[PDB]
Amino acid sequence: GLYEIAPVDLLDETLKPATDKKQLSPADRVFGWVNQRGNGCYKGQLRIHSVTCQHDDAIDDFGNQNFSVPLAILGQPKPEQARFYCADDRKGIPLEDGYDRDDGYSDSEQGLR
RNA sequence: ACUGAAACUGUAGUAGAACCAAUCGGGGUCGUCAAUA
């Protein structure tokens, strides 16, 4: 079954991605913006460039170019685990412990973590 | 009731000036799944 409320309704309109040039937040101004739900874009005021590795033997190959380490499983994030991803208010407090699972994503006055 | 003749619609003139194919984005990461009896 479904939680009562969609996560987009638990995030404030002042925190959603910007949709107007008049509502560009600090990081939208510094790093730039393109409107995903309309017209509008801004070139970033910050540019990263000239990334130079200073060390030459910087890459560990673990003995041979044909060796590899198998990494631990990197699973998909599962926001449906409300106790981890839902907040008990808009200021980002965790859900209270002990409550029924139905109590995540339940109230408009709840929030995202 | 005696055809005029002969005469290059040519000569000069740059389809061009201006305009960034561009703006935003870490190749990233964890909780189950399934519905009967």
Side-chain angles (χ1 to χ4, degrees):
Chain A
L2 303 180
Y3 298 99
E4 188 165 325
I5 301 184
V8 75
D9 298 334
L10 293 194
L11 185 75
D12 191 74
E13 210 76 351
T14 68
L15 287 171
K16 289 185 179 80
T19 56
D20 192 292
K21 294 167 182 282
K22 275 59 161 66
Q23 72 164 211
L24 303 197
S25 77
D28 307 312
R29 298 184 316 246
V30 176
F31 295 85
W33 165 77
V34 168
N35 197 353
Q36 306 301 307
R37 298 304 308 120
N39 188 23
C41 52
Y42 185 59
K43 185 176 184 176
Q45 285 174 233
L46 183 152
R47 169 176 154 240
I48 287 150
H49 66 93
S50 308
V51 187
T52 305
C53 186
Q54 308 307 141
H55 293 65
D56 51 0
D57 205 10
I59 292 162
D60 197 1
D61 68 307
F62 316 107
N64 289 262
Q65 293 291 336
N66 68 340
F67 292 176
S68 286
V69 54
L71 300 189
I73 292 170
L74 293 173
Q76 293 287 345
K78 292 153 179 87
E80 321 204 292
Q81 183 34 279
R83 289 203 188 82
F84 280 52
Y85 292 81
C86 197
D88 209 37
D89 65 12
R90 292 284 171 132
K91 72 172 188 295
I93 294 294
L95 296 191
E96 296 195 321
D97 310 330
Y99 285 77
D100 299 317
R101 188 160 180 157
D102 178 52
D103 212 65
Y105 310 103
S106 314
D107 322 316
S108 191
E109 59 263 48
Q110 282 186 322
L112 291 189
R113 282 296 296 272

PDB file of all heavy atoms in Angstrom, chain A residues 43-75:
ATOM      1  N   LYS A  43      23.740  30.945 -16.233  1.00  0.00           N
ATOM      2  CA  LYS A  43      25.094  30.427 -16.225  1.00  0.00           C
ATOM      3  C   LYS A  43      25.691  30.534 -14.829  1.00  0.00           C
ATOM      4  O   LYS A  43      25.543  31.544 -14.149  1.00  0.00           O
ATOM      5  CB  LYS A  43      25.945  31.168 -17.240  1.00  0.00           C
ATOM      6  CG  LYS A  43      27.320  30.618 -17.366  1.00  0.00           C
ATOM      7  CD  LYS A  43      28.066  31.316 -18.431  1.00  0.00           C
ATOM      8  CE  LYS A  43      29.410  30.703 -18.611  1.00  0.00           C
ATOM      9  NZ  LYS A  43      30.135  31.329 -19.727  1.00  0.00           N
ATOM     10  N   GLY A  44      26.379  29.478 -14.412  1.00  0.00           N
ATOM     11  CA  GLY A  44      27.019  29.487 -13.112  1.00  0.00           C
ATOM     12  C   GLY A  44      28.080  30.561 -12.991  1.00  0.00           C
ATOM     13  O   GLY A  44      28.822  30.846 -13.932  1.00  0.00           O
ATOM     14  N   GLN A  45      28.112  31.194 -11.832  1.00  0.00           N
ATOM     15  CA  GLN A  45      29.155  32.133 -11.452  1.00  0.00           C
ATOM     16  C   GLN A  45      30.421  31.466 -10.937  1.00  0.00           C
ATOM     17  O   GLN A  45      31.323  32.171 -10.500  1.00  0.00           O
ATOM     18  CB  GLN A  45      28.609  33.097 -10.413  1.00  0.00           C
ATOM     19  CG  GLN A  45      27.700  34.125 -11.000  1.00  0.00           C
ATOM     20  CD  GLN A  45      27.062  34.985  -9.957  1.00  0.00           C
ATOM     21  OE1 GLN A  45      25.852  35.138  -9.917  1.00  0.00           O
ATOM     22  NE2 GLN A  45      27.873  35.546  -9.091  1.00  0.00           N
ATOM     23  N   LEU A  46      30.495  30.140 -10.926  1.00  0.00           N
ATOM     24  CA  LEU A  46      31.636  29.400 -10.405  1.00  0.00           C
ATOM     25  C   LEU A  46      32.077  28.385 -11.441  1.00  0.00           C
ATOM     26  O   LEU A  46      31.249  27.645 -11.971  1.00  0.00           O
ATOM     27  CB  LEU A  46      31.271  28.709  -9.090  1.00  0.00           C
ATOM     28  CG  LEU A  46      32.275  27.911  -8.269  1.00  0.00           C
ATOM     29  CD1 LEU A  46      31.890  27.952  -6.827  1.00  0.00           C
ATOM     30  CD2 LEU A  46      32.331  26.467  -8.720  1.00  0.00           C
ATOM     31  N   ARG A  47      33.377  28.333 -11.710  1.00  0.00           N
ATOM     32  CA  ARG A  47      33.946  27.451 -12.722  1.00  0.00           C
ATOM     33  C   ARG A  47      35.115  26.680 -12.133  1.00  0.00           C
ATOM     34  O   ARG A  47      36.080  27.280 -11.662  1.00  0.00           O
ATOM     35  CB  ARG A  47      34.389  28.258 -13.945  1.00  0.00           C
ATOM     36  CG  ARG A  47      35.211  27.511 -14.947  1.00  0.00           C
ATOM     37  CD  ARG A  47      35.503  28.382 -16.143  1.00  0.00           C
ATOM     38  NE  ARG A  47      36.729  27.997 -16.838  1.00  0.00           N
ATOM     39  CZ  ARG A  47      37.780  28.800 -16.998  1.00  0.00           C
ATOM     40  NH1 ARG A  47      37.787  30.024 -16.484  1.00  0.00           N
ATOM     41  NH2 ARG A  47      38.842  28.378 -17.653  1.00  0.00           N
ATOM     42  N   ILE A  48      35.029  25.360 -12.152  1.00  0.00           N
ATOM     43  CA  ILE A  48      36.124  24.486 -11.748  1.00  0.00           C
ATOM     44  C   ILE A  48      36.872  24.053 -12.994  1.00  0.00           C
ATOM     45  O   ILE A  48      36.258  23.696 -14.002  1.00  0.00           O
ATOM     46  CB  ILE A  48      35.611  23.277 -10.948  1.00  0.00           C
ATOM     47  CG1 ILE A  48      35.174  23.727  -9.559  1.00  0.00           C
ATOM     48  CG2 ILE A  48      36.652  22.198 -10.847  1.00  0.00           C
ATOM     49  CD1 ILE A  48      34.093  22.928  -8.988  1.00  0.00           C
ATOM     50  N   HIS A  49      38.192  24.140 -12.949  1.00  0.00           N
ATOM     51  CA  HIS A  49      39.008  23.907 -14.128  1.00  0.00           C
ATOM     52  C   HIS A  49      40.424  23.553 -13.705  1.00  0.00           C
ATOM     53  O   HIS A  49      40.789  23.656 -12.536  1.00  0.00           O
ATOM     54  CB  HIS A  49      38.976  25.120 -15.062  1.00  0.00           C
ATOM     55  CG  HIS A  49      39.624  26.341 -14.496  1.00  0.00           C
ATOM     56  ND1 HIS A  49      40.944  26.655 -14.712  1.00  0.00           N
ATOM     57  CD2 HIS A  49      39.115  27.351 -13.756  1.00  0.00           C
ATOM     58  CE1 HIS A  49      41.230  27.787 -14.100  1.00  0.00           C
ATOM     59  NE2 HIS A  49      40.136  28.229 -13.514  1.00  0.00           N
ATOM     60  N   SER A  50      41.204  23.090 -14.681  1.00  0.00           N
ATOM     61  CA  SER A  50      42.635  22.830 -14.533  1.00  0.00           C
ATOM     62  C   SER A  50      42.948  21.759 -13.499  1.00  0.00           C
ATOM     63  O   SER A  50      43.938  21.860 -12.784  1.00  0.00           O
ATOM     64  CB  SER A  50      43.402  24.110 -14.214  1.00  0.00           C
ATOM     65  OG  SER A  50      43.099  25.118 -15.151  1.00  0.00           O
ATOM     66  N   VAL A  51      42.104  20.740 -13.382  1.00  0.00           N
ATOM     67  CA  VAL A  51      42.332  19.679 -12.405  1.00  0.00           C
ATOM     68  C   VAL A  51      43.570  18.891 -12.816  1.00  0.00           C
ATOM     69  O   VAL A  51      43.593  18.256 -13.870  1.00  0.00           O
ATOM     70  CB  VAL A  51      41.116  18.764 -12.256  1.00  0.00           C
ATOM     71  CG1 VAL A  51      41.353  17.815 -11.120  1.00  0.00           C
ATOM     72  CG2 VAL A  51      39.877  19.573 -12.016  1.00  0.00           C
ATOM     73  N   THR A  52      44.616  18.972 -12.013  1.00  0.00           N
ATOM     74  CA  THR A  52      45.895  18.354 -12.317  1.00  0.00           C
ATOM     75  C   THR A  52      46.237  17.399 -11.188  1.00  0.00           C
ATOM     76  O   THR A  52      46.302  17.813 -10.032  1.00  0.00           O
ATOM     77  CB  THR A  52      47.001  19.403 -12.476  1.00  0.00           C
ATOM     78  OG1 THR A  52      46.627  20.364 -13.466  1.00  0.00           O
ATOM     79  CG2 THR A  52      48.304  18.743 -12.892  1.00  0.00           C
ATOM     80  N   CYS A  53      46.446  16.132 -11.514  1.00  0.00           N
ATOM     81  CA  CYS A  53      47.052  15.221 -10.553  1.00  0.00           C
ATOM     82  C   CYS A  53      48.541  15.522 -10.413  1.00  0.00           C
ATOM     83  O   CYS A  53      49.262  15.617 -11.408  1.00  0.00           O
ATOM     84  CB  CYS A  53      46.836  13.773 -10.978  1.00  0.00           C
ATOM     85  SG  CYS A  53      47.380  12.554  -9.788  1.00  0.00           S
ATOM     86  N   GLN A  54      48.994  15.708  -9.179  1.00  0.00           N
ATOM     87  CA  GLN A  54      50.395  16.005  -8.923  1.00  0.00           C
ATOM     88  C   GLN A  54      51.249  14.757  -8.768  1.00  0.00           C
ATOM     89  O   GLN A  54      52.427  14.772  -9.132  1.00  0.00           O
ATOM     90  CB  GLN A  54      50.526  16.871  -7.671  1.00  0.00           C
ATOM     91  CG  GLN A  54      49.655  18.118  -7.668  1.00  0.00           C
ATOM     92  CD  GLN A  54      49.825  18.972  -8.904  1.00  0.00           C
ATOM     93  OE1 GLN A  54      48.861  19.519  -9.428  1.00  0.00           O
ATOM     94  NE2 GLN A  54      51.058  19.125  -9.352  1.00  0.00           N
ATOM     95  N   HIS A  55      50.692  13.685  -8.230  1.00  0.00           N
ATOM     96  CA  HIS A  55      51.395  12.415  -8.126  1.00  0.00           C
ATOM     97  C   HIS A  55      51.349  11.658  -9.440  1.00  0.00           C
ATOM     98  O   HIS A  55      50.349  11.690 -10.156  1.00  0.00           O
ATOM     99  CB  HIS A  55      50.786  11.572  -7.014  1.00  0.00           C
ATOM    100  CG  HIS A  55      50.993  12.145  -5.653  1.00  0.00           C
ATOM    101  ND1 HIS A  55      50.436  13.338  -5.259  1.00  0.00           N
ATOM    102  CD2 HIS A  55      51.698  11.691  -4.593  1.00  0.00           C
ATOM    103  CE1 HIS A  55      50.789  13.596  -4.015  1.00  0.00           C
ATOM    104  NE2 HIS A  55      51.553  12.611  -3.587  1.00  0.00           N
ATOM    105  N   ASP A  56      52.444  10.977  -9.760  1.00  0.00           N
ATOM    106  CA  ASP A  56      52.503  10.205 -10.995  1.00  0.00           C
ATOM    107  C   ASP A  56      52.070   8.755 -10.802  1.00  0.00           C
ATOM    108  O   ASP A  56      51.259   8.242 -11.577  1.00  0.00           O
ATOM    109  CB  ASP A  56      53.906  10.292 -11.594  1.00  0.00           C
ATOM    110  CG  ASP A  56      54.974   9.965 -10.601  1.00  0.00           C
ATOM    111  OD1 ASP A  56      54.625   9.666  -9.442  1.00  0.00           O
ATOM    112  OD2 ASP A  56      56.161  10.021 -10.972  1.00  0.00           O
ATOM    113  N   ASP A  57      52.606   8.077  -9.806  1.00  0.00           N
ATOM    114  CA  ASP A  57      52.191   6.706  -9.522  1.00  0.00           C
ATOM    115  C   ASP A  57      50.914   6.646  -8.685  1.00  0.00           C
ATOM    116  O   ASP A  57      50.788   5.827  -7.777  1.00  0.00           O
ATOM    117  CB  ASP A  57      53.339   5.971  -8.838  1.00  0.00           C
ATOM    118  CG  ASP A  57      53.270   4.482  -9.042  1.00  0.00           C
ATOM    119  OD1 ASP A  57      52.451   4.040  -9.871  1.00  0.00           O
ATOM    120  OD2 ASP A  57      54.037   3.750  -8.382  1.00  0.00           O
ATOM    121  N   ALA A  58      49.952   7.517  -8.985  1.00  0.00           N
ATOM    122  CA  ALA A  58      48.818   7.754  -8.106  1.00  0.00           C
ATOM    123  C   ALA A  58      47.802   6.622  -8.085  1.00  0.00           C
ATOM    124  O   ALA A  58      47.030   6.529  -7.132  1.00  0.00           O
ATOM    125  CB  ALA A  58      48.122   9.046  -8.515  1.00  0.00           C
ATOM    126  N   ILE A  59      47.787   5.754  -9.086  1.00  0.00           N
ATOM    127  CA  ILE A  59      46.754   4.734  -9.205  1.00  0.00           C
ATOM    128  C   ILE A  59      47.290   3.428  -8.653  1.00  0.00           C
ATOM    129  O   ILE A  59      48.328   2.931  -9.098  1.00  0.00           O
ATOM    130  CB  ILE A  59      46.287   4.575 -10.658  1.00  0.00           C
ATOM    131  CG1 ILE A  59      45.529   5.821 -11.102  1.00  0.00           C
ATOM    132  CG2 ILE A  59      45.414   3.364 -10.804  1.00  0.00           C
ATOM    133  CD1 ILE A  59      45.400   5.952 -12.572  1.00  0.00           C
ATOM    134  N   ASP A  60      46.584   2.887  -7.665  1.00  0.00           N
ATOM    135  CA  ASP A  60      46.804   1.533  -7.182  1.00  0.00           C
ATOM    136  C   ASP A  60      46.131   0.545  -8.116  1.00  0.00           C
ATOM    137  O   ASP A  60      44.906   0.499  -8.194  1.00  0.00           O
ATOM    138  CB  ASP A  60      46.264   1.394  -5.768  1.00  0.00           C
ATOM    139  CG  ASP A  60      46.792   0.182  -5.068  1.00  0.00           C
ATOM    140  OD1 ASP A  60      47.595  -0.546  -5.674  1.00  0.00           O
ATOM    141  OD2 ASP A  60      46.409  -0.050  -3.910  1.00  0.00           O
ATOM    142  N   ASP A  61      46.926  -0.248  -8.819  1.00  0.00           N
ATOM    143  CA  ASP A  61      46.480  -1.516  -9.371  1.00  0.00           C
ATOM    144  C   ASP A  61      47.042  -2.590  -8.470  1.00  0.00           C
ATOM    145  O   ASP A  61      48.234  -2.578  -8.151  1.00  0.00           O
ATOM    146  CB  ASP A  61      46.956  -1.720 -10.808  1.00  0.00           C
ATOM    147  CG  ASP A  61      48.453  -1.912 -10.903  1.00  0.00           C
ATOM    148  OD1 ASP A  61      49.197  -1.065 -10.370  1.00  0.00           O
ATOM    149  OD2 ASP A  61      48.889  -2.907 -11.514  1.00  0.00           O
ATOM    150  N   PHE A  62      46.194  -3.484  -8.029  1.00  0.00           N
ATOM    151  CA  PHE A  62      46.454  -4.188  -6.791  1.00  0.00           C
ATOM    152  C   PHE A  62      47.468  -5.304  -6.942  1.00  0.00           C
ATOM    153  O   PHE A  62      47.467  -6.244  -6.145  1.00  0.00           O
ATOM    154  CB  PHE A  62      45.132  -4.699  -6.241  1.00  0.00           C
ATOM    155  CG  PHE A  62      44.054  -3.688  -6.323  1.00  0.00           C
ATOM    156  CD1 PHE A  62      43.041  -3.810  -7.242  1.00  0.00           C
ATOM    157  CD2 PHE A  62      44.088  -2.577  -5.515  1.00  0.00           C
ATOM    158  CE1 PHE A  62      42.066  -2.869  -7.310  1.00  0.00           C
ATOM    159  CE2 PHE A  62      43.115  -1.635  -5.585  1.00  0.00           C
ATOM    160  CZ  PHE A  62      42.103  -1.777  -6.477  1.00  0.00           C
ATOM    161  N   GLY A  63      48.313  -5.235  -7.963  1.00  0.00           N
ATOM    162  CA  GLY A  63      49.333  -6.234  -8.182  1.00  0.00           C
ATOM    163  C   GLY A  63      49.545  -6.482  -9.656  1.00  0.00           C
ATOM    164  O   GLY A  63      50.674  -6.669 -10.116  1.00  0.00           O
ATOM    165  N   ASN A  64      48.449  -6.469 -10.407  1.00  0.00           N
ATOM    166  CA  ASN A  64      48.476  -6.632 -11.849  1.00  0.00           C
ATOM    167  C   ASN A  64      47.329  -5.845 -12.447  1.00  0.00           C
ATOM    168  O   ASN A  64      46.325  -5.579 -11.788  1.00  0.00           O
ATOM    169  CB  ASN A  64      48.365  -8.102 -12.267  1.00  0.00           C
ATOM    170  CG  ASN A  64      49.604  -8.895 -11.951  1.00  0.00           C
ATOM    171  OD1 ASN A  64      50.448  -9.110 -12.819  1.00  0.00           O
ATOM    172  ND2 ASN A  64      49.726  -9.340 -10.705  1.00  0.00           N
ATOM    173  N   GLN A  65      47.486  -5.484 -13.718  1.00  0.00           N
ATOM    174  CA  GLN A  65      46.428  -4.781 -14.424  1.00  0.00           C
ATOM    175  C   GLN A  65      45.191  -5.642 -14.620  1.00  0.00           C
ATOM    176  O   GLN A  65      44.132  -5.110 -14.964  1.00  0.00           O
ATOM    177  CB  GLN A  65      46.940  -4.275 -15.773  1.00  0.00           C
ATOM    178  CG  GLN A  65      48.007  -3.187 -15.663  1.00  0.00           C
ATOM    179  CD  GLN A  65      47.467  -1.864 -15.137  1.00  0.00           C
ATOM    180  OE1 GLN A  65      46.276  -1.575 -15.252  1.00  0.00           O
ATOM    181  NE2 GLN A  65      48.345  -1.054 -14.559  1.00  0.00           N
ATOM    182  N   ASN A  66      45.293  -6.952 -14.436  1.00  0.00           N
ATOM    183  CA  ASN A  66      44.130  -7.819 -14.537  1.00  0.00           C
ATOM    184  C   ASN A  66      43.507  -8.172 -13.188  1.00  0.00           C
ATOM    185  O   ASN A  66      42.507  -8.890 -13.160  1.00  0.00           O
ATOM    186  CB  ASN A  66      44.485  -9.089 -15.322  1.00  0.00           C
ATOM    187  CG  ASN A  66      45.448  -9.985 -14.589  1.00  0.00           C
ATOM    188  OD1 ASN A  66      46.141  -9.552 -13.676  1.00  0.00           O
ATOM    189  ND2 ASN A  66      45.508 -11.245 -14.996  1.00  0.00           N
ATOM    190  N   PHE A  67      44.063  -7.697 -12.077  1.00  0.00           N
ATOM    191  CA  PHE A  67      43.377  -7.850 -10.804  1.00  0.00           C
ATOM    192  C   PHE A  67      42.252  -6.829 -10.652  1.00  0.00           C
ATOM    193  O   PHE A  67      42.241  -5.773 -11.285  1.00  0.00           O
ATOM    194  CB  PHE A  67      44.353  -7.697  -9.641  1.00  0.00           C
ATOM    195  CG  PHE A  67      45.359  -8.798  -9.531  1.00  0.00           C
ATOM    196  CD1 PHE A  67      46.344  -8.740  -8.571  1.00  0.00           C
ATOM    197  CD2 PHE A  67      45.314  -9.896 -10.364  1.00  0.00           C
ATOM    198  CE1 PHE A  67      47.271  -9.752  -8.452  1.00  0.00           C
ATOM    199  CE2 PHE A  67      46.236 -10.907 -10.243  1.00  0.00           C
ATOM    200  CZ  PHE A  67      47.215 -10.833  -9.286  1.00  0.00           C
ATOM    201  N   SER A  68      41.314  -7.143  -9.761  1.00  0.00           N
ATOM    202  CA  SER A  68      40.273  -6.210  -9.355  1.00  0.00           C
ATOM    203  C   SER A  68      39.799  -6.593  -7.967  1.00  0.00           C
ATOM    204  O   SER A  68      39.913  -7.745  -7.555  1.00  0.00           O
ATOM    205  CB  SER A  68      39.075  -6.200 -10.312  1.00  0.00           C
ATOM    206  OG  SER A  68      39.383  -5.541 -11.523  1.00  0.00           O
ATOM    207  N   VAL A  69      39.287  -5.612  -7.245  1.00  0.00           N
ATOM    208  CA  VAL A  69      38.538  -5.841  -6.015  1.00  0.00           C
ATOM    209  C   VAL A  69      37.050  -5.747  -6.333  1.00  0.00           C
ATOM    210  O   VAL A  69      36.615  -4.740  -6.905  1.00  0.00           O
ATOM    211  CB  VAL A  69      38.954  -4.855  -4.902  1.00  0.00           C
ATOM    212  CG1 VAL A  69      38.841  -3.446  -5.359  1.00  0.00           C
ATOM    213  CG2 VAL A  69      38.082  -5.032  -3.680  1.00  0.00           C
ATOM    214  N   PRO A  70      36.256  -6.769  -6.016  1.00  0.00           N
ATOM    215  CA  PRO A  70      34.793  -6.637  -6.058  1.00  0.00           C
ATOM    216  C   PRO A  70      34.269  -5.805  -4.895  1.00  0.00           C
ATOM    217  O   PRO A  70      34.443  -6.162  -3.733  1.00  0.00           O
ATOM    218  CB  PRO A  70      34.317  -8.088  -5.996  1.00  0.00           C
ATOM    219  CG  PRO A  70      35.366  -8.763  -5.218  1.00  0.00           C
ATOM    220  CD  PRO A  70      36.665  -8.094  -5.529  1.00  0.00           C
ATOM    221  N   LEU A  71      33.627  -4.691  -5.217  1.00  0.00           N
ATOM    222  CA  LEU A  71      33.099  -3.797  -4.203  1.00  0.00           C
ATOM    223  C   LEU A  71      31.861  -4.384  -3.532  1.00  0.00           C
ATOM    224  O   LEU A  71      31.177  -5.249  -4.076  1.00  0.00           O
ATOM    225  CB  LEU A  71      32.761  -2.441  -4.813  1.00  0.00           C
ATOM    226  CG  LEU A  71      33.901  -1.659  -5.464  1.00  0.00           C
ATOM    227  CD1 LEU A  71      33.435  -0.278  -5.809  1.00  0.00           C
ATOM    228  CD2 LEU A  71      35.131  -1.614  -4.584  1.00  0.00           C
ATOM    229  N   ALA A  72      31.606  -3.935  -2.306  1.00  0.00           N
ATOM    230  CA  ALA A  72      30.355  -4.253  -1.638  1.00  0.00           C
ATOM    231  C   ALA A  72      29.169  -3.698  -2.421  1.00  0.00           C
ATOM    232  O   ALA A  72      29.286  -2.717  -3.156  1.00  0.00           O
ATOM    233  CB  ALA A  72      30.358  -3.703  -0.218  1.00  0.00           C
ATOM    234  N   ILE A  73      28.019  -4.355  -2.270  1.00  0.00           N
ATOM    235  CA  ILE A  73      26.825  -3.972  -3.012  1.00  0.00           C
ATOM    236  C   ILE A  73      26.467  -2.523  -2.739  1.00  0.00           C
ATOM    237  O   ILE A  73      26.313  -2.106  -1.585  1.00  0.00           O
ATOM    238  CB  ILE A  73      25.654  -4.898  -2.670  1.00  0.00           C
ATOM    239  CG1 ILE A  73      25.921  -6.297  -3.193  1.00  0.00           C
ATOM    240  CG2 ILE A  73      24.373  -4.352  -3.256  1.00  0.00           C
ATOM    241  CD1 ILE A  73      24.953  -7.282  -2.705  1.00  0.00           C
ATOM    242  N   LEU A  74      26.343  -1.746  -3.805  1.00  0.00           N
ATOM    243  CA  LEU A  74      25.829  -0.383  -3.749  1.00  0.00           C
ATOM    244  C   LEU A  74      24.373  -0.373  -4.209  1.00  0.00           C
ATOM    245  O   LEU A  74      24.080  -0.220  -5.391  1.00  0.00           O
ATOM    246  CB  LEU A  74      26.706   0.529  -4.589  1.00  0.00           C
ATOM    247  CG  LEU A  74      28.123   0.743  -4.059  1.00  0.00           C
ATOM    248  CD1 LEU A  74      28.943   1.518  -5.050  1.00  0.00           C
ATOM    249  CD2 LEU A  74      28.111   1.445  -2.722  1.00  0.00           C
ATOM    250  N   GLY A  75      23.453  -0.553  -3.255  1.00  0.00           N
ATOM    251  CA  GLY A  75      22.041  -0.630  -3.561  1.00  0.00           C
ATOM    252  C   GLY A  75      21.404   0.712  -3.866  1.00  0.00           C
ATOM    253  O   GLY A  75      21.929   1.772  -3.555  1.00  0.00           O
TER     254      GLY A  75
END
